[PDB]
């Protein structure tokens, strides 16, 4: 039973993952709507910022999102003039997408606002505490993945 | 890039892991629950009734932050499996109140013992100070984003 206090505490942290994800999404949306876009649209803009010229299937794999969802969001951001499609002379059906200057400006603004807010949050903790958070967060992700594949 | 960029880039990567983490937790938990013959959703209801014996379905819904349709579906599954029972509510007949059966009790106990033993295995890889920092920052982040969502 010597580990009980620690596992009770860790379980409480693990249980906060679900409300945390809901709160991240809702907080993110506050910032994205100021730039006229949704959270889902932001995800696609961030994806194309990271990999200019990606295909819809590639974006789906990178963002771990279903084809249907990627397809809908691509249409929304394209209609809004935030991305453009260029021809793919190697494989014509493999449509490739790039941010437009406006889409670039929007995702840049969103990211700067988000990092400024993360900086605010971080001011309340030592870098040692935050580094421990990161290490444990990633190790838990790994740990549960392994249990799901193996146990 | 100002002096905080390294730290916020790292924290951002941690925040971004929240979605695959929740997926992986759910998948890992399901491995344990199916060994005792139940699903993850069924486990959530058994755990809720373990914590508050005699709860109503709306009370469980509020405690678990789940929709009434979902709670209703799961309550039927566990009742059909003989894991919970409904008792009469002579104060408000409409307000059905539920309790674990001894079988439901055995199952959720077994699931919880297994989950905690696996959390202890994980925890062996870290100092208690690291894990405490994780808990503190986890809960502080939950609050921080809640506040942004309500206020910004």
XYZ file of C-alpha atoms in Angstrom:
303
model
C 0.000 0.000 0.000
C 3.050 2.316 0.261
C 2.435 3.542 -3.319
C -1.258 4.252 -2.730
C -0.910 8.002 -2.030
C 1.199 8.433 -5.173
C -1.038 6.364 -7.466
C -4.196 8.041 -6.048
C -2.602 11.406 -6.897
C -1.432 10.269 -10.360
C -4.866 8.781 -11.057
C -6.441 12.169 -10.223
C -4.069 13.843 -12.735
C -4.844 11.197 -15.372
C -8.578 11.730 -14.785
C -8.110 15.498 -15.523
C -7.005 14.665 -19.102
C -10.600 14.599 -20.399
C -11.705 17.992 -18.924
C -8.234 19.398 -19.828
C -8.743 18.532 -23.522
C -12.252 20.107 -23.508
C -10.797 23.277 -21.852
C -7.857 23.503 -24.270
C -10.301 23.323 -27.195
C -12.645 25.953 -25.742
C -9.695 28.278 -24.827
C -8.084 27.806 -28.254
C -11.454 28.654 -29.930
C -11.562 31.997 -28.102
C -8.276 32.959 -29.773
C -9.081 31.532 -33.221
C -12.468 33.311 -33.496
C -10.717 36.666 -32.912
C -8.943 35.895 -36.243
C -12.195 34.728 -37.853
C -11.533 30.980 -37.823
C -12.624 27.869 -35.929
C -10.440 25.391 -33.953
C -10.697 22.815 -36.758
C -9.705 25.429 -39.358
C -6.742 26.408 -37.169
C -5.613 22.739 -37.065
C -5.507 22.653 -40.910
C -3.722 26.020 -41.157
C -1.152 24.864 -38.596
C -0.711 21.591 -40.552
C -0.063 23.480 -43.811
C 2.246 25.909 -42.037
C 4.310 22.889 -40.981
C 4.159 21.066 -44.333
C 3.430 23.463 -47.256
C 2.147 21.499 -50.265
C 0.740 18.548 -48.262
C -2.065 16.472 -49.745
C -5.354 15.971 -47.889
C -4.392 12.360 -47.042
C -1.000 13.543 -45.730
C -2.686 16.187 -43.552
C -5.106 13.546 -42.280
C -2.181 11.273 -41.282
C -0.194 14.157 -39.686
C -3.158 15.497 -37.724
C -4.597 12.007 -37.013
C -7.987 13.106 -38.386
C -10.490 11.320 -40.601
C -10.677 12.042 -44.330
C -14.262 13.412 -43.987
C -13.212 15.996 -41.419
C -10.072 17.090 -43.317
C -12.163 17.390 -46.505
C -14.786 19.599 -44.874
C -12.228 21.897 -43.248
C -10.118 22.231 -46.417
C -13.234 23.448 -48.231
C -14.040 25.970 -45.489
C -10.527 27.490 -45.430
C -10.266 27.483 -49.221
C -13.679 29.233 -49.564
C -12.374 31.783 -47.030
C -9.288 32.409 -49.211
C -6.818 31.054 -46.588
C -5.352 28.190 -48.611
C -4.948 27.461 -52.306
C -4.631 24.263 -54.336
C -1.816 23.929 -56.869
C -1.584 21.375 -59.671
C 0.356 18.166 -59.054
C 1.985 17.235 -62.375
C 3.327 13.932 -60.975
C -0.013 12.561 -59.744
C -2.905 14.776 -60.811
C -5.453 13.475 -58.249
C -3.011 14.130 -55.365
C -4.138 17.718 -54.785
C -1.523 19.740 -52.914
C -2.311 22.746 -50.732
C -0.499 25.895 -49.564
C -1.375 28.694 -47.182
C -2.205 32.002 -48.863
C -0.651 35.203 -47.476
C -3.869 35.781 -45.480
C -3.905 32.190 -44.138
C -0.277 32.621 -43.150
C -1.044 35.927 -41.345
C -3.938 34.334 -39.455
C -2.046 31.224 -38.225
C 0.971 33.407 -37.312
C -1.282 35.686 -35.197
C -3.019 32.754 -33.552
C 0.293 31.052 -32.627
C 1.801 34.243 -31.240
C -1.268 34.760 -29.034
C -1.209 31.130 -27.820
C 2.488 31.202 -26.953
C 2.118 34.493 -25.144
C -0.617 32.898 -23.023
C 1.520 29.772 -22.383
C 4.317 32.143 -21.271
C 1.896 33.777 -18.808
C 0.946 30.394 -17.431
C 4.607 29.282 -17.228
C 5.579 32.317 -15.088
C 3.766 30.616 -12.196
C 6.106 27.548 -12.183
C 9.853 26.801 -12.168
C 11.303 25.484 -15.422
C 12.078 22.271 -13.420
C 8.360 21.744 -12.685
C 7.393 22.388 -16.309
C 10.092 20.069 -17.575
C 8.815 17.345 -15.197
C 5.307 17.937 -16.557
C 6.528 17.473 -20.150
C 8.593 14.358 -19.333
C 5.760 12.667 -17.435
C 3.103 13.710 -20.007
C 5.073 12.114 -22.861
C 6.050 9.052 -20.786
C 2.389 8.449 -19.861
C 1.330 8.777 -23.523
C 3.927 6.089 -24.331
C 2.989 3.947 -21.321
C -0.744 3.787 -22.146
C -0.004 3.218 -25.858
C 2.114 0.221 -24.888
C -0.598 -1.156 -22.570
C -3.158 -0.770 -25.350
C -0.904 -2.644 -27.848
C 0.213 -5.333 -25.293
C -1.979 -5.824 -22.164
C 11.744 34.101 -30.137
C 12.152 35.767 -26.739
C 13.690 34.057 -23.704
C 10.559 31.976 -22.971
C 10.362 30.414 -26.418
C 12.163 27.175 -25.502
C 9.903 26.670 -22.472
C 6.658 27.486 -24.272
C 7.618 25.323 -27.270
C 8.216 22.451 -24.855
C 4.963 23.119 -22.907
C 3.070 23.377 -26.192
C 4.371 19.930 -27.219
C 3.167 18.586 -23.854
C -0.256 20.261 -24.328
C -0.503 18.806 -27.840
C 0.031 15.293 -26.378
C -3.271 15.612 -24.440
C -5.399 14.296 -27.346
C -3.320 11.171 -28.150
C -2.937 10.650 -24.361
C -6.699 10.558 -23.813
C -7.094 8.114 -26.762
C -4.325 5.888 -25.306
C -5.746 6.000 -21.753
C -9.146 4.883 -23.129
C -7.600 2.060 -25.195
C -5.372 0.919 -22.233
C -8.299 1.045 -19.789
C -10.433 -1.061 -22.210
C -7.823 -3.833 -22.161
C -8.291 -4.078 -18.389
C -12.071 -3.741 -18.419
C -12.663 -6.426 -21.074
C -10.735 -8.944 -18.901
C -13.589 -8.467 -16.367
C -16.211 -8.628 -19.113
C -17.096 -4.935 -19.321
C -16.497 -1.926 -21.599
C -14.865 1.438 -20.728
C -18.268 3.153 -20.667
C -19.643 0.450 -18.329
C -16.581 0.845 -16.047
C -17.271 4.633 -15.817
C -20.837 3.927 -14.549
C -19.668 1.204 -12.096
C -17.032 3.590 -10.770
C -19.624 6.357 -10.397
C -21.961 4.069 -8.397
C -19.022 2.844 -6.296
C -18.406 6.465 -5.345
C -22.064 7.418 -4.841
C -24.264 4.333 -4.082
C -27.949 5.173 -4.709
C -27.298 7.909 -7.327
C -29.954 8.783 -9.900
C -29.155 8.704 -13.607
C -29.164 12.524 -13.792
C -26.779 12.633 -10.778
C -24.417 10.170 -12.468
C -24.625 12.243 -15.658
C -23.655 15.385 -13.715
C -20.822 13.589 -11.776
C -19.348 11.934 -14.865
C -20.087 14.950 -17.155
C -21.830 12.667 -19.639
C -25.037 13.156 -21.656
C -28.232 11.606 -20.409
C -28.527 9.413 -23.559
C -25.106 7.913 -22.912
C -25.791 7.312 -19.178
C -29.162 5.716 -20.061
C -27.590 3.350 -22.581
C -24.870 2.233 -20.165
C -27.176 1.843 -17.161
C -29.279 -0.594 -19.199
C -26.226 -2.602 -20.261
C -24.907 -3.012 -16.705
C -28.346 -3.751 -15.287
C -29.004 -6.381 -17.943
C -25.582 -7.868 -17.032
C -26.679 -8.048 -13.373
C -24.053 -5.529 -12.173
C -26.369 -2.842 -10.790
C -29.915 -2.888 -9.423
C -32.606 -0.216 -9.166
C -34.343 0.390 -5.837
C -37.641 2.254 -5.284
C -37.466 5.947 -4.394
C -40.424 6.540 -2.088
C -39.713 10.319 -1.916
C -39.810 10.932 -5.702
C -40.840 7.748 -7.532
C -39.608 9.061 -10.911
C -36.066 9.498 -9.487
C -34.781 5.940 -9.944
C -31.843 5.178 -7.689
C -29.129 2.651 -8.473
C -26.694 0.466 -6.539
C -23.902 -1.913 -7.484
C -24.738 -5.603 -7.008
C -22.094 -7.807 -5.310
C -20.946 -8.872 -8.850
C -20.718 -5.238 -10.013
C -18.814 -4.505 -6.821
C -16.335 -7.386 -7.476
C -15.760 -6.256 -11.086
C -15.050 -2.551 -10.345
C -12.808 -3.514 -7.392
C -10.814 -5.839 -9.644
C -10.532 -3.252 -12.416
C -9.354 -0.545 -9.980
C -6.765 -2.831 -8.329
C -5.308 -3.663 -11.741
C -5.237 0.008 -12.889
C -3.511 1.149 -9.705
C -0.930 -1.632 -9.880
C -0.166 -0.490 -13.459
C 0.065 3.161 -12.320
C 2.545 2.049 -9.603
C 4.647 0.280 -12.222
C 4.732 3.470 -14.241
C 5.503 5.612 -11.166
C 8.598 3.478 -10.374
C 10.254 5.177 -13.346
C 10.048 8.662 -11.727
C 10.774 10.420 -8.415
C 7.750 11.420 -6.350
C 8.809 15.091 -6.924
C 8.497 14.648 -10.696
C 5.063 13.047 -10.340
C 3.888 15.713 -7.936
C 5.029 18.399 -10.415
C 3.102 16.578 -13.128
C -0.079 16.556 -10.989
C 0.305 20.232 -9.959
C 0.881 21.446 -13.536
C -1.860 19.161 -14.942
C -4.468 20.596 -12.589
C -3.153 24.170 -12.974
C -3.378 23.872 -16.768
C -6.948 22.540 -16.536
C -7.863 25.655 -14.514
C -5.856 27.995 -16.753
C -7.648 26.918 -19.955
C -11.037 26.840 -18.169
C -10.461 30.492 -17.243
C -9.382 31.489 -20.761
C -12.486 29.779 -22.151
C -14.740 31.628 -19.643
C -12.908 35.025 -19.792
C -10.869 35.475 -23.019
